[PDB]
Amino acid sequence: AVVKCKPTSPGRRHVVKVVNPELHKGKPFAPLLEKNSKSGGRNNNGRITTRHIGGGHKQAYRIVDFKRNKDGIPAVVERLEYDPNRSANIALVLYKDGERRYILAPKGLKAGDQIQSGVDAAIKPGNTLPMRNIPVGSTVHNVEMKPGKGGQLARSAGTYVQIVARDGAYVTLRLRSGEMRKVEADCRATLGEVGNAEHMLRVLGKAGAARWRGVRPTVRGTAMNPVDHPHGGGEGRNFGKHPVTPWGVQTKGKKTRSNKRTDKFIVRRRS
Amino acid sequence: MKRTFQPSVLKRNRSHGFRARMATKNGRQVLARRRAKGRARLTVSK
Amino acid sequence: MIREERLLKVLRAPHVSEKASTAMEKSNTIVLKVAKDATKAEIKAAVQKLFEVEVEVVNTLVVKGKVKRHGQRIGRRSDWKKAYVTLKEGQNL
RNA sequence: GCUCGCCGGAAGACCAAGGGUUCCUGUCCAACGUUAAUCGGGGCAGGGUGAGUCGACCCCUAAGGCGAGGCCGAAAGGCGUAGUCGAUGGGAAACAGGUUAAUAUUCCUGUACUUGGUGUUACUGCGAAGGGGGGACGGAGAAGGCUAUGUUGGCCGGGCGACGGUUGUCCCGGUUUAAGCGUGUAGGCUGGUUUUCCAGGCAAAUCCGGAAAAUCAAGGCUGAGGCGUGAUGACGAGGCACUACGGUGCUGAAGCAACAAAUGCCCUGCUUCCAGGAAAAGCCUCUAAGCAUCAGGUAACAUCAAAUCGUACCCCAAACCGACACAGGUGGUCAGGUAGAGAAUACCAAGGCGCUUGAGAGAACUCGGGUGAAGGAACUAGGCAAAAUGGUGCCGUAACUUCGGGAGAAGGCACGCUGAUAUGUAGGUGAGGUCCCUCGCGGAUGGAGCUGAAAUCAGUCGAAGAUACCAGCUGGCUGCAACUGUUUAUUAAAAACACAGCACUGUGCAAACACGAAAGUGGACGUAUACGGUGUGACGCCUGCCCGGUGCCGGAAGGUUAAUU
RNA sequence: AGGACCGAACCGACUAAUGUUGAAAAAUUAGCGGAUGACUUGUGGCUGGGGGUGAAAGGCCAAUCAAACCGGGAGAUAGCU
Ligand SMILES: [Mg+2]
Ligand SMILES: [Mg+2]
Ligand SMILES: [Mg+2]
Ligand SMILES: [Mg+2]
Ligand SMILES: [Mg+2]
Ligand SMILES: [Mg+2]
Ligand SMILES: [Mg+2]
Ligand SMILES: [Mg+2]
Ligand SMILES: [Mg+2]
Ligand SMILES: [Mg+2]
Ligand SMILES: [Mg+2]
Ligand SMILES: [Mg+2]
Ligand SMILES: [Mg+2]
Ligand SMILES: [Mg+2]
Ligand SMILES: [Mg+2]
Ligand SMILES: [Mg+2]
Ligand SMILES: [Mg+2]
Ligand SMILES: [Mg+2]
Ligand SMILES: [Mg+2]
Ligand SMILES: [Mg+2]
Ligand SMILES: [Mg+2]
Ligand SMILES: [Mg+2]
Ligand SMILES: [Mg+2]
Ligand SMILES: [Mg+2]
Ligand SMILES: [Mg+2]
Ligand SMILES: [Mg+2]
Ligand SMILES: [Mg+2]
Ligand SMILES: [Mg+2]
Ligand SMILES: [Mg+2]
Ligand SMILES: [Mg+2]
Ligand SMILES: [Mg+2]
Ligand SMILES: [Mg+2]
Ligand SMILES: [Mg+2]
Ligand SMILES: [Mg+2]
Ligand SMILES: [Mg+2]
Ligand SMILES: [Mg+2]
Ligand SMILES: [Mg+2]
Ligand SMILES: [Mg+2]
Ligand SMILES: [Mg+2]
Ligand SMILES: [Mg+2]
Ligand SMILES: [Mg+2]
Ligand SMILES: [Mg+2]
Ligand SMILES: [Mg+2]
Ligand SMILES: [Mg+2]
Ligand SMILES: [Mg+2]
Ligand SMILES: [Mg+2]
Ligand SMILES: [Mg+2]
Ligand SMILES: [Mg+2]
Ligand SMILES: [Mg+2]
Ligand SMILES: [Mg+2]
Ligand SMILES: [Mg+2]
Ligand SMILES: [Mg+2]
Ligand SMILES: [Mg+2]
Ligand SMILES: [Mg+2]
Ligand SMILES: [Mg+2]
Ligand SMILES: [Mg+2]
Ligand SMILES: [Mg+2]
């Protein structure tokens, strides 16, 4: 559900919120919860290594099963849940032997639905199979890059991967970026799209809403002095130079990928 | 107004105390310099 | 059991003041100066063995030595321990 | 000592931090104290800090620190594993009265509570470094039940008034009591019990999770406050006998109800929202190795233990941070009366103070204020400053608008006191009595007593009734920035910065990028609906032409071209 | 409901006067802005000098900042006074 707030105050005028009625209103499953304090973008030297990070709401980490390696035990979806740590929603599933787990909730999945993993799983959304057993043309998500490592590709809200080809031991995947990549056919994938496709229709509306998510203000380079940015300086608004990062690398079109180890797997760049 | 010195005994001992000096070779060199000068008070400890 | 040598060492002096005398009268309590490291149990055992009276409780405090200016030089008297020894209402030490 | 004045959400009281004897007593007045000093936070001397329950220490962890081995690095060293530290957080237990010149939840009196070690008895499956439950957690809002507390009445004791009245519907004062134990309430959550089974909880489990049936329909957990006991005790206004005038001591009445009522408690509750809200131990439970009539566990009684350290005093300040006995700064708690929406404000209570130079005079001028004829911005860079407006209820309110606003637009009327309605109304609170039952801190009825707005009418005083304190000036046109925010600590608060939104661009995850000779770390326990960089800056309508120059992206025929040979 | 409204505590600092060998090496008085939030505050911790940190003023990093402080090279050099 996408609903616009009424302009009863200037900070509310442009707010557009995503409210999902189905989401659980209670507390999360306690044994599947771990704490994680914030870093502020600071590394173990105590230096800011990533700017514009800090503050925001306290969050508990939910242990999500990206591996999906209970083969042959059917599971039932108990309830959808809000996960602060990611854009997608998650589903708390109960296994027939009494094990409870969190999974990425695919589009369409709801309470009472059955899911299953393994080679003999039925082709239906939320089921996990090796891509050997998944037909060419299927839409999948939570794609493994190595067998047994856990899904790593297409995990954000509303994303998915298209299985384009299958030759030998490798499948050709079409990624959200447009890149065509090769991954091993033993790698597991989950049928269907990631849910919460309406997540991109949100409008924060005010600066405080970005602050609630741990995002600190960005200061433009041209607004500062030359001592601390190549864009700095000037009597009035002056630029006269090719745009660069704070460290001097050109930031409009220059390419930065340098990985000859994984170049063999890239069928075509995203263009 | 609020001034620069705002005393805390715990912070004082953790910053300049005897154990803090002993924990690094540079602090041990501070202690050697102060012993060689003949200082009655080596650190802020007491 | 605490050793006899320790008991002979712990007790130092009886404290003489009007508060101590009021303790002796009102509450049958003697006030002593003891060693800085003399515990309550050692004080009780030493009073019983060395003053031959029955004790039911001792109370202790540490007195901080004062700072005194003697000939413009700065000095500090030593800290000492003081004991309030209650005799169990039948002794009259 | 008697008056006077000042603070009283503090200028009173208690703490933490910080200080360290400044605390109390005697004595002294050189120096110190912005003057004197007989006085002092000054000199000198003596005295003073009493704990199983308060805190530390202790058990347990957060951020973070250190870190055996380890990985890395010319050396020095960096990071990090197992671990081990680290509160600002979790974890056993005490209250009231009395007492010193100076301590007291520590001493004394009374009445309690916690944990541990032993000893005996009786029953008996005990046991972890492991499994599980629990601890255990956000913001906002609403209502009910309470209590602290206050007011009035009743009750007790005392009074009969320096000037007209004051035996009464008069005046003054008191009317207090804890923890614990018993009760299990207003209320909150949740269906129980019993069989059998199981791809789960690293092994196991009767424990937790799941599955299938029977049976019953009330069980369990939590819970302020009240009541009873504690307590025939203590305290108590006042009386009495001495005084060192400070006080010593004896006795000591009544000690009830109603009403109002928190920002405190029930409540870590309930409702709701999105930004989705510590950890670990104590604690309960389950077993494994193991022991296996032993040990150990449980229940009762006895008895012993609870150490050490802190404890004086200041603590919005003359004792801390400011070189000062300095108009500065400094976290938490307590929270009376009248009026008031109020922790504003005025006047007061408890309590605390008059700020460590005074005495005169009554010039100019300076500072801070009061009032002002006639005029009313003529002043000036500029209405700077000042003057003015100011409350509640009701009526009434334009352009424009993103339909929310604009708006308290503007403007206007009423406003005190007395009586009546109504010997106190509508409402709120609620006793006695009666009726019922799964019988009590129960249900229903009944409404005495108490408390008590708003309105209308009539009358009445003053120049003036939101009378003091307190408490919006309003309107028209226009530049800039959408807006709330941020900034040059100490001459600039803005049109500057940020901002939601927009766009370009990079990035396929051992991501790009950043900090690092490195190992690693952040990005992120994220995965293109993501993350970084850059510019623009809500929203509406839009965003034209140029790739010659510079940059970037792509291409590789040809020219040129390094080490090398 | 709200980076909603009026307004104390609390956080700030727009105007004026005083003060300028100050009561004060940045305050006082009267007015002024925010006041449930991008709020404010206590305790503890981390980031170190061509480095940090910065809603960006070359601001801030112990009354010191277009390169902190302390010690050292060091009696730097000074065609200048
Ligand atoms: Mg960024
Ligand atoms: Mg931005
Ligand atoms: Mg600038
Ligand atoms: Mg440059
Ligand atoms: Mg220009
Ligand atoms: Mg130009
Ligand atoms: Mg002294
Ligand atoms: Mg004194
Ligand atoms: Mg004299
Ligand atoms: Mg003098
Ligand atoms: Mg003195
Ligand atoms: Mg003690
Ligand atoms: Mg005792
Ligand atoms: Mg840690
Ligand atoms: Mg080592
Ligand atoms: Mg380390
Ligand atoms: Mg520890
Ligand atoms: Mg603590
Ligand atoms: Mg005292
Ligand atoms: Mg009451
Ligand atoms: Mg409040
Ligand atoms: Mg005290
Ligand atoms: Mg003075
Ligand atoms: Mg002062
Ligand atoms: Mg303050
Ligand atoms: Mg006031
Ligand atoms: Mg007054
Ligand atoms: Mg005059
Ligand atoms: Mg004048
Ligand atoms: Mg005037
Ligand atoms: Mg006039
Ligand atoms: Mg006139
Ligand atoms: Mg006029
Ligand atoms: Mg003019
Ligand atoms: Mg003129
Ligand atoms: Mg003005
Ligand atoms: Mg005025
Ligand atoms: Mg113009
Ligand atoms: Mg603006
Ligand atoms: Mg503003
Ligand atoms: Mg500021
Ligand atoms: Mg300035
Ligand atoms: Mg300014
Ligand atoms: Mg990584
Ligand atoms: Mg701009
Ligand atoms: Mg613009
Ligand atoms: Mg253009
Ligand atoms: Mg507001
Ligand atoms: Mg405003
Ligand atoms: Mg002011
Ligand atoms: Mg306001
Ligand atoms: Mg500049
Ligand atoms: Mg400075
Ligand atoms: Mg330099
Ligand atoms: Mg040289
Ligand atoms: Mg020289
Ligand atoms: Mg020359």
Side-chain angles (χ1 to χ4, degrees):
Chain A
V2 169
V3 292
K4 181 153 202 96
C5 290
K6 282 197 192 291
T8 46
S9 66
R12 293 288 287 198
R13 177 178 296 277
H14 305 292
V15 173
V16 173
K17 72 214 301 198
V18 160
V19 184
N20 190 355
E22 294 303 281
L23 293 197
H24 185 53
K25 290 183 180 296
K27 308 260 162 210
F29 196 52
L32 289 183
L33 283 151
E34 173 175 23
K35 65 90 175 179
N36 59 336
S37 44
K38 308 149 172 302
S39 64
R42 268 83 163 171
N43 80 334
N44 62 341
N45 295 328
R47 304 277 187 94
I48 293 163
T49 64
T50 303
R51 305 179 308 161
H52 322 120
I53 287 173
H57 210 286
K58 189 170 192 174
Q59 296 168 340
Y61 184 74
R62 281 86 168 147
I63 291 154
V64 176
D65 188 5
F66 296 114
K67 272 165 186 180
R68 296 292 305 273
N69 59 2
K70 291 177 71 68
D71 295 343
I73 295 96
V76 54
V77 173
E78 315 208 301
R79 61 184 200 241
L80 277 298
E81 275 186 28
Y82 177 87
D83 193 355
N85 299 273
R86 65 192 76 261
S87 46
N89 290 317
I90 63 176
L92 165 79
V93 304
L94 168 63
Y95 280 95
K96 183 175 174 66
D97 48 26
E99 208 191 312
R100 276 188 179 82
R101 272 182 202 197
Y102 274 132
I103 68 170
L104 291 181
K107 179 181 181 53
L109 194 74
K110 67 184 182 187
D113 280 18
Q114 295 298 109
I115 66 154
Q116 183 155 9
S117 82
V119 304
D120 52 50
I123 314 292
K124 65 182 181 180
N127 279 10
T128 313
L129 290 93
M131 290 201 249
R132 277 217 173 71
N133 308 115
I134 302 183
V136 174
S138 304
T139 287
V140 300
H141 63 283
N142 194 42
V143 176
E144 279 180 346
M145 279 172 54
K146 289 186 176 180
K149 204 175 169 190
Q152 282 191 294
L153 304 152
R155 289 158 34 155
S156 290
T159 51
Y160 65 71
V161 174
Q162 183 67 41
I163 293 174
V164 187
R166 198 172 36 205
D167 291 293
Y170 279 99
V171 297
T172 301
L173 301 183
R174 178 135 66 201
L175 308 185
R176 286 303 287 152
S177 55
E179 190 197 80
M180 318 285 288
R181 195 207 166 93
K182 291 177 71 68
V183 73
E184 266 197 74
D186 291 331
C187 292
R188 299 166 166 272
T190 316
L191 269 298
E193 293 83 3
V194 186
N196 204 31
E198 75 275 28
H199 156 87
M200 48 177 180
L201 301 180
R202 183 177 292 171
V203 180
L204 294 184
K206 58 169 179 159
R211 305 296 312 267
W212 297 337
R213 290 154 200 275
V215 175
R216 289 195 86 241
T218 298
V219 183
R220 296 163 296 121
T222 194
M224 64 184 73
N225 299 129
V227 70
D228 52 22
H229 207 287
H231 291 184
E235 285 294 82
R237 308 197 169 106
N238 280 341
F239 208 67
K241 66 178 72 75
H242 306 116
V244 294
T245 71
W247 301 273
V249 176
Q250 189 275 331
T251 190
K252 293 277 161 102
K254 181 181 188 308
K255 290 177 181 335
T256 62
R257 167 178 173 90
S258 189
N259 194 325
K260 291 198 199 303
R261 181 183 47 92
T262 62
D263 271 357
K264 65 178 72 66
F265 311 100
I266 314 292
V267 176
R268 186 177 74 260
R269 305 289 290 150
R270 70 184 188 280
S271 74
Chain B
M1 284 73 74
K2 185 177 180 180
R3 292 308 170 176
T4 48
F5 182 50
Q6 302 294 328
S8 172
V9 172
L10 169 66
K11 284 174 72 175
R12 178 161 189 88
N13 288 341
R14 285 191 187 165
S15 296
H16 321 291
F18 179 83
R19 300 205 94 235
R21 297 286 195 237
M22 293 306 294
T24 51
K25 65 90 176 179
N26 281 318
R28 298 196 289 268
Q29 278 170 255
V30 166
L31 294 179
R33 284 200 305 272
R34 289 181 77 81
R35 283 196 178 104
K37 195 171 189 176
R39 287 281 188 185
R41 281 82 65 193
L42 282 72
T43 65
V44 311
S45 187
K46 186 179 289 293
Chain C
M1 183 177 176
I2 316 180
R3 295 186 61 193
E4 187 97 9
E5 293 179 353
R6 184 64 182 131
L7 277 61
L8 294 174
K9 298 293 183 182
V10 289
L11 305 170
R12 312 308 316 187
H15 192 42
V16 162
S17 64
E18 176 50 26
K19 182 179 164 71
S21 299
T22 299
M24 284 213 301
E25 301 218 2
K26 298 282 190 285
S27 293
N28 189 359
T29 297
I30 63 165
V31 192
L32 302 160
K33 307 208 185 73
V34 297
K36 182 68 181 294
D37 68 324
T39 55
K40 286 184 184 173
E42 310 170 320
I43 286 151
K44 188 202 187 100
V47 173
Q48 286 190 171
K49 182 67 181 294
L50 294 174
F51 285 164
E52 290 304 319
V53 288
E54 301 278 71
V55 188
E56 79 266 44
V57 60
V58 306
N59 279 4
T60 70
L61 58 91
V62 177
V63 174
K64 313 307 183 286
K66 290 173 182 178
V67 171
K68 295 272 147 182
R69 288 197 82 91
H70 175 258
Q72 198 177 355
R73 193 173 295 110
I74 197 73
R76 186 188 177 271
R77 293 173 164 153
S78 296
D79 297 356
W80 54 284
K81 196 181 268 189
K82 176 158 79 191
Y84 290 104
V85 177
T86 305
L87 320 173
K88 50 175 62 186
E89 69 266 12
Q91 270 60 47
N92 308 139
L93 162 61

